[PDB]
Amino acid sequence: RRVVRGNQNQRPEFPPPRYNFTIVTTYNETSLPSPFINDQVKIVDVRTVAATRPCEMIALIAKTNVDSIIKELDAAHKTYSARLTWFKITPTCATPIHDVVYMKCNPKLLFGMCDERSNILWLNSLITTAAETDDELGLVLASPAHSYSGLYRRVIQIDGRRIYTDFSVTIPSSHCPLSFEQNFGNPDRCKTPEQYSRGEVYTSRFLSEFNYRQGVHLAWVKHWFVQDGGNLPVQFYEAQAFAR
């Protein structure tokens, strides 16, 4: 288990928690449904994202209809379970890079505001340069390398409904010395359509936990990016307005 270690006087400021949840580190797993689209037709929101300078921090963000599904369960007066999974997708295989399972979700509230969740899973080589956005549905990527270029797919599962968003990402060719190479295409983590179909993909077997709430994880990712020389885009600043 990854833990953050070091002197208190080197911490960033942490925004207050959004929702007090319990990580059920012992919950027993189900295989990952295939992210490939074949026999179940889906509408997909397709976005494009391009970094314009080396080591640029970027965010994969797109409004979805997730609330219209959550609030259908509210009108039914049903709590629900959910799953969030990010993939890097190629025609031959798909690599899950972030995966979370949610239980006892109150549909009066927003996505992710659920009493329980699984371990919060990440590709281990992304933990210091990646985190969720504030509503837990976006992905922040610090110091990408050129090899990050390609197709990213987010699958949100709410009860028995699924939402797909694709991001076509371009990163320029100059080298970023702050980056980590993810080797996204490695067959240990890049799983074929057949492997998903046969029910054989279990994220606990190859992703790693970073069981810190979003506000703490992103605060650290932004702090480490700047302390290593990165130029933080104003998009990732917080509002102080007139206060303090």
Residue numbers in the entry: 34 to 277
Article, verbatim:
Equine herpesvirus type 1 (EHV-1) and EHV-4 gDs interact with equine major histocompatibility complex I (MHC-I) to initiate entry into equine cells. Of these, gD is the (main) receptor-binding protein that interacts with the cell receptors and triggers the subsequent fusion process with cell membrane and/or uptake by endocytosis. The structures of gD1 and gD4 revealed the existence of a common V-set immunoglobulin-like (IgV-like) core comparable to those of other gD homologs. The cores consist of a nine-stranded (A′, B, C, C′, C″, D, E, F, and G) β-barrel, arranged in a typical V-like Ig fold, flanked by N- and C-terminal extensions with loops, α-helices (α1, α2, α3’, and α3), and small β-strands (str2-4).
Glycoprotein D4 was crystallized with one protein per asymmetric unit. In total 244 residues could be modeled (R34 to R277). The overall folds of gD1 and gD4 are very similar with a root-mean-square deviation (rmsd) of 0.7 Å for 220 common Cα atoms. In the structures of gD1 and gD4, six cysteines were found to form three disulfide bonds at sites conserved in members of the gD plolypeptide family: C87/C209, C126/C223, and C138/C147. Apparent dissociation constants ( Kdapp ) of 7,000 ± 2,000 nM and 5,800 ± 760 nM were calculated for gD1 and gD4, respectively. Additionally, the receptor affinity of a C-terminally truncated EHV-4 gD, gD436-280, was tested. The truncated gD4 version, gD436-280, exhibited a receptor binding affinity to MHC-I in the same order of magnitude (6,700 ± 750 nM). That the C-terminal truncation had no significant effect on the receptor affinity of EHV-4 gD suggests that the mode of binding differs from other alphaherpesviruses, however, the role of the C-terminus remains to be determined. For EHV-4, the infection was reduced by an average of 32% after blocking the cells with soluble gD4 recombinant protein. gD4 was also able to block the entry of EHV-1 by 40%. The EHV-1 gD complex was one of the 3% best scored results and the EHV-4 gD complex was in the 11% top results suggesting that both docking solutions represent low-energy protein complexes.
